[PDB]
Amino acid sequence: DRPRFSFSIAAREGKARTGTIEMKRGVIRTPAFMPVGTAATVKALKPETVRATGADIILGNTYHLMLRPGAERIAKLGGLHSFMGWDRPILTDSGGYQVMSLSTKQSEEGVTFKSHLDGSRHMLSPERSIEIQHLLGSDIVMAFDECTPYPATPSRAASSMERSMRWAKRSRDAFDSRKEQAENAALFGIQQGSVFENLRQQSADALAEIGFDGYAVGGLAVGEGQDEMFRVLDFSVPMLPDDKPHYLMGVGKPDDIVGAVERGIDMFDCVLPTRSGRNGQAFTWDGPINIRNARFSEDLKPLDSECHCAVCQKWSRAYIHHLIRAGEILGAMLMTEHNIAFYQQLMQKIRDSISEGRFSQFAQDFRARYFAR
Amino acid sequence: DRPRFSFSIAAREGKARTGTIEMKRGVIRTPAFMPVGTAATVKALKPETVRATGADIILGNTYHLMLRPGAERIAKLGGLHSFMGWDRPILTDSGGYQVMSLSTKQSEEGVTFKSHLDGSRHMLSPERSIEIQHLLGSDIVMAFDECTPYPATPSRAASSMERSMRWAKRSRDAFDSRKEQAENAALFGIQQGSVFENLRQQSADALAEIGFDGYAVGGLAVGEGQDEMFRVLDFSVPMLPDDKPHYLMGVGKPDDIVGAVERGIDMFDCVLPTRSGRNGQAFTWDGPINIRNARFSEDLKPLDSECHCAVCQKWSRAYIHHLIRAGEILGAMLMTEHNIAFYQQLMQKIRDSISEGRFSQFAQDFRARYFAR
Ligand SMILES: NC[C@H]1CC[C@H](C(=O)O)CC1
Ligand SMILES: NC[C@H]1CC[C@H](C(=O)O)CC1
Ligand SMILES: [Zn+2]
Ligand SMILES: [Zn+2]
């Protein structure tokens, strides 16, 4: 009864947009932050807790899931949604980045690699990546890509991007060939081209000619720094179709997100709130804090005194400081819940401010406070 | 408005009893199982989840808390209940066992020891143990004791027990001297004497002459085995005042609990459900299972198909198998919630069967199924 994929822009301010993506398993409010659920879990959180923070969609990692527990096994057990107990949309990455980063023989067919878990040999290609994502049952499927190497010659960046675009076409065809997947899921293409404007334009042109439900900006946050990332976004996002969502992969810190929204990004995923939470870093409106620091040992205030999350209604900095220092699982649980909730509250403030035509003021006020610490 | 400590026996069957302990922070249904909350947390569970499993009271470890975060610090922050977010009764052990086990110079005054965290030197005595438990704000205070060495000569067991009894009297006096503690908390004494009937009798006589709110059987589950433990319980529990609760410290497996209740024990604590849960062992009515075992990789049944816990309503063995094998925090969370809930359901079945005069049949039926596997 619900649409497969319908993106509606409710309001704009400059290059920033806010709206909704309607899918069969639910609505995604944009700009959206996707918690990362690597191995079929958002680390340290039950799915009901993830939803309670405000998340509309989560990300799964194809590379990890294809190795453990395996895509065929997850399919036999009813698909990823049933397996993990999350009934809302899931976006899966293609695996093309982790094979190169977490594993390796690359050719036009795909990449063959050795598993980090045990050294067993495996293969990923556009067709196999799409089939794995089909078996997982994910709602948003990412085309199999290659991250343009950084730094690299313009010619190496170009040949990499061109291969990635041929892989995008192969991914489109594989997805379209599977009727159940084509009728129930969406397919996003990934723009490559490193920091080179002409290559980003050629990539965008190729992707629009193939046609996708959404367009990701790939190849960023790979060591170039925020200033350069924003410079590339300045020219790259306008090259993508305006009427489809724009997804910045693997970004980022709160200030990265705000600046990327100012440049036309609608969707984000990042390991920071979960991973840094487990390591003792909490995000607050006055900047990040390291909760293990001695200054918090007797601080009875919550992590953030304006945060609406359940953790900040019930527990102090002093208690969470103790838990993390003692290596207690509850410390990781509470830090992660707060950090994901903080990210969702940030996204809500972004959406409301764009809707209300006051996003420029919000971004200025946010930065002045977040960086004042 | 509520009583400090009021124990009522509602029903008996043989040596087994069921009833309630009413305290200012709540009612404890007996026989009772106390989850162990070492470092101001029941590992991997929020307090609301602990309560949802049916627990009425939890245990804190004085030795750990006095080292990290420290008793004075917890007191400055409002006491242990506020610090951890558990508003119901807490029982604290005395520290007398862990100093000897987890750390050491023993004299009549107390024991001086080196901390396992850093080698700093510390002191525990009856008076200091009581003061630490006062600063923590615990509801049931344990007298500072010495575990009778096992094995040991009857004469060494006797001298150890006699020292423990002098320490019990010192603990009573220190507790009574602190009006706020005496008016709001309860004090339990610990019977010692190893496996020797005459020493257990002398210990019980000494404790009853001092007078306590409850009586623990100490010095068991120290390597003697279940048959010998039950033999000692057979003669030791009847020596304690019948009209006060009987607490078996550090026990145990489900079948240990059932047999101890048959011998007159009203209260238990054990690390097994939490620690073994994190390590992949789940308790079921058909015996323990090791969820990491390959046989569970595609098992869509819950951990136990008759368990009422939230985990067994929502997640499969196959998913929990995957989580534990992958080292995921959510695996520990789900295993621990189920195991504590299983222990609470066991206690509820014990209480109902005693109340209903069918505990002997319950114990027989429980054992036949649990050991059939
Ligand atoms: N720094 C994260 C980023 C790495 C490259 C990846 C890709 O281009 O596939 C997108 C995410
Ligand atoms: N095996 C646990 C048991 C160890 C001795 C202790 C004590 O006697 O203080 C009670 C608990
Ligand atoms: Zn919060
Ligand atoms: Zn269960």
PDB file of C-alpha atoms in Angstrom, chain B residues 82-225:
ATOM      1  CA  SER B  82      21.058   7.639  43.373  1.00  0.00           C
ATOM      2  CA  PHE B  83      24.465   7.067  41.759  1.00  0.00           C
ATOM      3  CA  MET B  84      23.378   3.962  39.845  1.00  0.00           C
ATOM      4  CA  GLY B  85      19.655   4.713  39.461  1.00  0.00           C
ATOM      5  CA  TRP B  86      18.311   1.782  41.499  1.00  0.00           C
ATOM      6  CA  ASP B  87      15.795   2.934  44.111  1.00  0.00           C
ATOM      7  CA  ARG B  88      14.953  -0.492  45.623  1.00  0.00           C
ATOM      8  CA  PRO B  89      16.893  -2.396  48.318  1.00  0.00           C
ATOM      9  CA  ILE B  90      20.611  -3.077  47.932  1.00  0.00           C
ATOM     10  CA  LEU B  91      22.573  -5.617  49.970  1.00  0.00           C
ATOM     11  CA  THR B  92      26.312  -4.968  50.269  1.00  0.00           C
ATOM     12  CA  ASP B  93      28.805  -7.634  51.155  1.00  0.00           C
ATOM     13  CA  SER B  94      31.362  -6.784  53.793  1.00  0.00           C
ATOM     14  CA  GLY B  95      34.526  -6.998  51.694  1.00  0.00           C
ATOM     15  CA  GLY B  96      36.049  -9.583  54.018  1.00  0.00           C
ATOM     16  CA  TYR B  97      36.095 -12.281  51.348  1.00  0.00           C
ATOM     17  CA  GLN B  98      37.404 -10.281  48.376  1.00  0.00           C
ATOM     18  CA  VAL B  99      40.307  -8.750  50.298  1.00  0.00           C
ATOM     19  CA  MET B 100      41.500 -12.309  50.860  1.00  0.00           C
ATOM     20  CA  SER B 101      40.593 -13.551  47.361  1.00  0.00           C
ATOM     21  CA  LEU B 102      41.001 -10.606  44.954  1.00  0.00           C
ATOM     22  CA  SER B 103      44.022  -8.945  46.604  1.00  0.00           C
ATOM     23  CA  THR B 104      47.462  -8.949  52.607  1.00  0.00           C
ATOM     24  CA  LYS B 105      48.172  -8.861  56.358  1.00  0.00           C
ATOM     25  CA  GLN B 106      45.518 -10.286  58.696  1.00  0.00           C
ATOM     26  CA  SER B 107      45.355  -9.509  62.424  1.00  0.00           C
ATOM     27  CA  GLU B 108      42.671  -9.210  65.085  1.00  0.00           C
ATOM     28  CA  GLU B 109      42.118  -5.574  64.066  1.00  0.00           C
ATOM     29  CA  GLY B 110      41.231  -6.391  60.451  1.00  0.00           C
ATOM     30  CA  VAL B 111      43.142  -6.891  57.231  1.00  0.00           C
ATOM     31  CA  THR B 112      45.529  -4.586  55.396  1.00  0.00           C
ATOM     32  CA  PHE B 113      45.871  -5.285  51.687  1.00  0.00           C
ATOM     33  CA  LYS B 114      47.182  -4.086  48.327  1.00  0.00           C
ATOM     34  CA  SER B 115      44.609  -3.033  45.736  1.00  0.00           C
ATOM     35  CA  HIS B 116      44.443  -5.167  42.602  1.00  0.00           C
ATOM     36  CA  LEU B 117      43.905  -2.035  40.500  1.00  0.00           C
ATOM     37  CA  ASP B 118      47.171  -0.323  41.412  1.00  0.00           C
ATOM     38  CA  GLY B 119      48.851  -1.866  44.467  1.00  0.00           C
ATOM     39  CA  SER B 120      47.839   0.982  46.779  1.00  0.00           C
ATOM     40  CA  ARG B 121      47.562  -0.138  50.401  1.00  0.00           C
ATOM     41  CA  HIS B 122      44.238  -0.154  52.251  1.00  0.00           C
ATOM     42  CA  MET B 123      42.589  -1.356  55.457  1.00  0.00           C
ATOM     43  CA  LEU B 124      39.336  -3.108  56.228  1.00  0.00           C
ATOM     44  CA  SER B 125      38.048  -3.852  59.713  1.00  0.00           C
ATOM     45  CA  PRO B 126      34.564  -4.443  61.144  1.00  0.00           C
ATOM     46  CA  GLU B 127      34.254  -0.735  61.906  1.00  0.00           C
ATOM     47  CA  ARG B 128      35.561   0.448  58.542  1.00  0.00           C
ATOM     48  CA  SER B 129      33.426  -2.072  56.638  1.00  0.00           C
ATOM     49  CA  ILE B 130      30.308  -0.869  58.445  1.00  0.00           C
ATOM     50  CA  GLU B 131      31.256   2.768  57.822  1.00  0.00           C
ATOM     51  CA  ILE B 132      31.814   2.094  54.102  1.00  0.00           C
ATOM     52  CA  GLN B 133      28.451   0.378  53.872  1.00  0.00           C
ATOM     53  CA  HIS B 134      26.916   3.354  55.706  1.00  0.00           C
ATOM     54  CA  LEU B 135      28.454   5.792  53.189  1.00  0.00           C
ATOM     55  CA  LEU B 136      27.146   3.645  50.328  1.00  0.00           C
ATOM     56  CA  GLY B 137      23.674   3.763  51.900  1.00  0.00           C
ATOM     57  CA  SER B 138      22.962   0.079  51.505  1.00  0.00           C
ATOM     58  CA  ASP B 139      19.772  -1.364  52.951  1.00  0.00           C
ATOM     59  CA  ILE B 140      21.163  -4.731  54.058  1.00  0.00           C
ATOM     60  CA  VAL B 141      24.625  -4.519  55.617  1.00  0.00           C
ATOM     61  CA  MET B 142      26.790  -7.620  56.019  1.00  0.00           C
ATOM     62  CA  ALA B 143      28.926  -8.012  59.103  1.00  0.00           C
ATOM     63  CA  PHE B 144      32.625  -8.156  58.338  1.00  0.00           C
ATOM     64  CA  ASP B 145      33.758 -11.755  58.372  1.00  0.00           C
ATOM     65  CA  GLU B 146      36.515 -14.180  57.526  1.00  0.00           C
ATOM     66  CA  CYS B 147      35.816 -17.160  55.297  1.00  0.00           C
ATOM     67  CA  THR B 148      36.945 -20.256  57.185  1.00  0.00           C
ATOM     68  CA  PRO B 149      39.837 -21.728  55.149  1.00  0.00           C
ATOM     69  CA  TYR B 150      38.990 -24.862  53.158  1.00  0.00           C
ATOM     70  CA  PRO B 151      40.420 -27.417  53.543  1.00  0.00           C
ATOM     71  CA  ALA B 152      41.879 -26.763  57.006  1.00  0.00           C
ATOM     72  CA  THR B 153      42.433 -28.470  60.328  1.00  0.00           C
ATOM     73  CA  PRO B 154      39.488 -28.361  62.733  1.00  0.00           C
ATOM     74  CA  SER B 155      41.641 -26.154  64.966  1.00  0.00           C
ATOM     75  CA  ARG B 156      42.391 -23.646  62.204  1.00  0.00           C
ATOM     76  CA  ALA B 157      38.718 -23.629  61.233  1.00  0.00           C
ATOM     77  CA  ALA B 158      37.823 -23.022  64.884  1.00  0.00           C
ATOM     78  CA  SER B 159      40.221 -20.116  65.419  1.00  0.00           C
ATOM     79  CA  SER B 160      39.060 -18.528  62.151  1.00  0.00           C
ATOM     80  CA  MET B 161      35.390 -18.917  63.078  1.00  0.00           C
ATOM     81  CA  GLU B 162      36.005 -17.462  66.559  1.00  0.00           C
ATOM     82  CA  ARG B 163      37.704 -14.400  65.075  1.00  0.00           C
ATOM     83  CA  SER B 164      34.816 -14.050  62.629  1.00  0.00           C
ATOM     84  CA  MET B 165      32.408 -14.118  65.603  1.00  0.00           C
ATOM     85  CA  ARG B 166      34.339 -11.393  67.437  1.00  0.00           C
ATOM     86  CA  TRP B 167      34.229  -9.402  64.215  1.00  0.00           C
ATOM     87  CA  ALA B 168      30.471  -9.991  64.071  1.00  0.00           C
ATOM     88  CA  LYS B 169      30.069  -8.442  67.527  1.00  0.00           C
ATOM     89  CA  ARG B 170      32.246  -5.478  66.522  1.00  0.00           C
ATOM     90  CA  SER B 171      30.128  -5.078  63.364  1.00  0.00           C
ATOM     91  CA  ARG B 172      26.908  -5.125  65.409  1.00  0.00           C
ATOM     92  CA  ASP B 173      28.250  -2.433  67.733  1.00  0.00           C
ATOM     93  CA  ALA B 174      29.508  -0.205  64.909  1.00  0.00           C
ATOM     94  CA  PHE B 175      26.166  -0.484  63.110  1.00  0.00           C
ATOM     95  CA  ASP B 176      24.174   0.271  66.279  1.00  0.00           C
ATOM     96  CA  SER B 177      26.342   3.354  66.957  1.00  0.00           C
ATOM     97  CA  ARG B 178      25.239   5.043  63.724  1.00  0.00           C
ATOM     98  CA  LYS B 179      21.640   6.049  64.437  1.00  0.00           C
ATOM     99  CA  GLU B 180      20.719   6.773  60.810  1.00  0.00           C
ATOM    100  CA  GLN B 181      22.021   3.373  59.746  1.00  0.00           C
ATOM    101  CA  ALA B 182      20.447   1.473  62.651  1.00  0.00           C
ATOM    102  CA  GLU B 183      17.043   3.088  62.007  1.00  0.00           C
ATOM    103  CA  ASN B 184      16.981   2.627  58.217  1.00  0.00           C
ATOM    104  CA  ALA B 185      19.056  -0.474  57.376  1.00  0.00           C
ATOM    105  CA  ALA B 186      19.338  -4.099  58.487  1.00  0.00           C
ATOM    106  CA  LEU B 187      22.405  -6.060  59.622  1.00  0.00           C
ATOM    107  CA  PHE B 188      23.056  -9.719  58.781  1.00  0.00           C
ATOM    108  CA  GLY B 189      25.556 -11.987  60.523  1.00  0.00           C
ATOM    109  CA  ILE B 190      27.536 -14.709  58.755  1.00  0.00           C
ATOM    110  CA  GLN B 191      27.834 -18.249  60.118  1.00  0.00           C
ATOM    111  CA  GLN B 192      31.243 -19.845  59.637  1.00  0.00           C
ATOM    112  CA  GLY B 193      32.812 -23.140  60.722  1.00  0.00           C
ATOM    113  CA  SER B 194      33.632 -24.796  57.374  1.00  0.00           C
ATOM    114  CA  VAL B 195      32.268 -28.381  57.139  1.00  0.00           C
ATOM    115  CA  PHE B 196      32.389 -29.024  60.911  1.00  0.00           C
ATOM    116  CA  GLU B 197      29.057 -29.421  62.673  1.00  0.00           C
ATOM    117  CA  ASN B 198      30.335 -28.422  66.121  1.00  0.00           C
ATOM    118  CA  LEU B 199      31.912 -25.225  64.774  1.00  0.00           C
ATOM    119  CA  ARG B 200      28.766 -24.344  62.802  1.00  0.00           C
ATOM    120  CA  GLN B 201      26.749 -24.781  66.016  1.00  0.00           C
ATOM    121  CA  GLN B 202      29.096 -22.561  68.018  1.00  0.00           C
ATOM    122  CA  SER B 203      28.967 -19.960  65.249  1.00  0.00           C
ATOM    123  CA  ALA B 204      25.158 -20.009  65.134  1.00  0.00           C
ATOM    124  CA  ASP B 205      24.980 -19.746  68.931  1.00  0.00           C
ATOM    125  CA  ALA B 206      27.346 -16.768  68.969  1.00  0.00           C
ATOM    126  CA  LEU B 207      25.421 -14.983  66.210  1.00  0.00           C
ATOM    127  CA  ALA B 208      22.054 -15.521  67.895  1.00  0.00           C
ATOM    128  CA  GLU B 209      23.469 -14.225  71.176  1.00  0.00           C
ATOM    129  CA  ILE B 210      24.620 -11.030  69.420  1.00  0.00           C
ATOM    130  CA  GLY B 211      21.365 -10.805  67.474  1.00  0.00           C
ATOM    131  CA  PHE B 212      20.965  -9.999  63.790  1.00  0.00           C
ATOM    132  CA  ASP B 213      18.148  -9.219  61.361  1.00  0.00           C
ATOM    133  CA  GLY B 214      19.211 -12.136  59.148  1.00  0.00           C
ATOM    134  CA  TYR B 215      21.718 -14.969  59.119  1.00  0.00           C
ATOM    135  CA  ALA B 216      23.953 -15.961  56.241  1.00  0.00           C
ATOM    136  CA  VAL B 217      25.627 -19.317  55.709  1.00  0.00           C
ATOM    137  CA  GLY B 218      29.160 -18.321  54.763  1.00  0.00           C
ATOM    138  CA  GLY B 219      32.136 -20.374  53.696  1.00  0.00           C
ATOM    139  CA  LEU B 220      30.383 -22.606  51.136  1.00  0.00           C
ATOM    140  CA  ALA B 221      30.766 -23.043  47.394  1.00  0.00           C
ATOM    141  CA  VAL B 222      34.521 -22.830  47.978  1.00  0.00           C
ATOM    142  CA  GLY B 223      35.389 -26.092  46.206  1.00  0.00           C
ATOM    143  CA  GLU B 224      33.568 -28.670  48.323  1.00  0.00           C
ATOM    144  CA  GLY B 225      31.042 -29.731  45.677  1.00  0.00           C
TER     145      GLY B 225
END
